[PDB]
């Protein structure tokens with residue numbers, strides 16, 4: 001039972017590290033091939049946004065098909081697919097030389113990520129039947145996701161200007177190959193998601209999570225381009241500037257998971273959304289790298305507060321009114337992240353092409369601040 | 383000197399706002415020997431008419447200076463206190479409030495104008511107005527229990543006589559330092575008032591102060607009626623309920639008058655809006671008296687933050703674009719103050735009977751929260767050509 005936990009942790013870690021490691025490398029890779037430096041990425045922001053939203057679009061498309069596929073052919077065969085398609089994606093990323101190959105790698109990564117996320121969690125649920133170690137296993141997997149998010153950003157940024165461009169992808173490929181060998185030596189219906197989104201409260205919670213995550217979603221594809229255009233930071237600090245967004249996130253989720261039950265979940269979500277908006281407003285004001293330490297850390301702490309205050313309310317709402325499954329909250333919450341990462345990067349390129357960069361953060365801040373009073377609905381649902 | 387001028391404004395706002403809260407626990411008790419509406423409109427008389435006199439006081443200060451309007455405010459305040467000490471009828475307890483409102487408008491406009499004129503540096507100007515607002519908070523905090531104990535032990539005419547004596551001391555001080563004996567016209571021709579509402583930044587700041595003061599002022603006349611309906615609390619706790627609001631307002635204005643220049647005016651006003659909105663949202667959820675300590679303290683801190691942030695910003699904008707005459711913009715700010723304090727008490731019971739107190743708090747918090755993002759516009763207004 002420990003081996004399956006190890007392989008699931010490794011797979012989620014690899015997926016999160018790949019997702020975080022593409023962000024430092026793609027803008028600098030595009031800039032290096034064509035020609036601090038000259039500014040011409042304003043035309044390419046829209047294609048960068050489409051490339052970043054490709055994985056979210058593919059995951060949303062392939063999500064409902066993965067459901068009944070596992071019942072027919074078990075869980076090992078589609079879990080085996082995630083490792084191999086992630087291998088093809090990480091191999092294509094290292095050897096990609098044109099924009100078209102990166103798109104194929106992104107969609108292939110999205111398909112593999114969806115398959116692995118369904119299959120590994122299903123295998124974890126099937127393996128543990130004691131009704132108490134399942135929660136610990138899920139918490140360990142989520143901590144692995146957090147660790148991958150923490151460690152992915154310094155990976156590519158540090159080892160692009162130092163040890164080459166293809167270096168950070170073959171290490172991930174070797175790690176994925178290690179995961180495949182580990183899993184190779186191996187061995188109640190719940191109101192479906194299409195009907196769970198028909199009540200106002202769960203929809204409000206999902207919208208709150210999506211609008212909280214949309215700030216980071218629009219911060220990812222457009223921040224390095226702004227950095228090279230304005231602050232003249234070196235190429236090894238673009239991924240260094242995103243450490244607070246994960247460190248403060250983990251600190252906030254720990255602290256507010258400990259202390260949100262006493263002072264109210266909806267109040268925690270409200271203040272988290274409000275400081276998300278304030279941090280997004282304060283982000284475009286910095287004129288150096290050190291100016292981003294404050295607003296980014298605040299945004300990460302706020303998003304951690306919002307998640308820690310919104311997941312238990314979603315679980316309670318699903319349990320009280322509908323029938324819950326072991327991973328019921330996973331489906332609704334994953335759709336919020338998927339919808340955010342699908343609508344953020346795509347619309348952000350057009351927004352930054354039409355108007356300036358800071359207006360996007362102003363728009364997102366007013367959107368978060370406006371949606372924040374809507375959290376009054378969630379206190380004591382009937 | 384420039385230090386004694388702030389001493390006069392500190393005493394002037396201390397006594398003028400002292401008369402505002404002293405009449406609260408002595409006036410309704412006297413008339414008892416539909417009644418709520420009659421008592422309610424008596425309290426709102428000062429707020430209703432100080433709005434009207436304000437547009438005639440702003441431009442008037444350009445041609446005669448600041449000393450004479452504040453001396454006139456002292457004279458009218460003394461007349462109001464002597465009328466309060468003797469009158470014992472509803473019809474005579476109305477012209478006194480009229481005179482109190484007129485004197486309050488004169489004193490507030492003249493004091494803020496002179497504080498803006500003497501204190502030129504923005505960072506230095508951000509502390510004098512903070513200490514003036516702290517003095518106003520001190521007056522509003524100390525007015526009610528003083529009048530209550532004076533009526534309880536010595537009688538009705540005693541506290542108004544003591545206020546008259548303190549007003550005479552303040553007038554002697556004003557004659558000592560300010561020297562209100564001649565009319566001095568300002569050399570610079572100030573901009574007309576009807577052009578100062580044609581720019582968005584002054585309108586945004588005025589709306590900020592107005593919305594924060596609505597959020598504070600609507601709660602006072604409506605809170606005890608809801609408390610007696612749901613909480614079932616004794617009479618003496620009604621005055622103690624709003625003590626944390628005044629204490630937190632004083633502490634917040636004193637601290638953020640220093641902190642506003644360092645941390646930022648727009649961020650301070652923004653956070654004050656969010657704090658006051660969340661406090662108004664969380665107010666109607668308490669099930670006992672102890673549950674109102676937190677939200678009320680946060681509400682008072684938010685009011686102090688908004689007031690301290692938006693006081694020097696008006697003079698900052700006027701210096702940035704228009705000519706250096708500060709009477710009109712602070713007249714607009716006092717208009718926002720008084721209109722917020724006037725709309726509340728006269729219509730609070732009607733709105734509570736119409737839609738309900740919790741819904742009213744929900745709308746007020748929602749308007750404050752939505753108007754909070756609009757304070758980003760005052761980050762850096764462009765200057766004049």
Ligand SMILES: COC(=O)[C@H]1[C@H]2C[C@@H]3c4[nH]c5cc(OC)ccc5c4CCN3C[C@H]2C[C@@H](OC(=O)c2cc(OC)c(OC)c(OC)c2)[C@@H]1OC
Pocket residue numbers: 016019020023142145146149153213216220242245246249300303311329330331333334337
């Ligand atoms: C990227 O990959 C993700 O998408 C993860 C994160 C998304 C987002 C993010 N991206 C960044 C990229 C950066 O570099 C540029 C820097 C900072 C950030 C931040 C800071 C903010 N941050 C939040 C991250 C959250 C992760 O998801 C969960 O941890 C989770 C938790 C749960 O409860 C405990 C769940 O319920 C059981 C659950 O299932 C639905 C999932 C989420 O998916 C796995």
Ligand SMILES: NCCc1ccc(O)c(O)c1
Pocket residue numbers: 522595598602624627628631682685689719
């Ligand atoms: N601008 C006044 C703000 C205020 C704060 C506390 C009070 O009790 C009050 O009556 C008024």
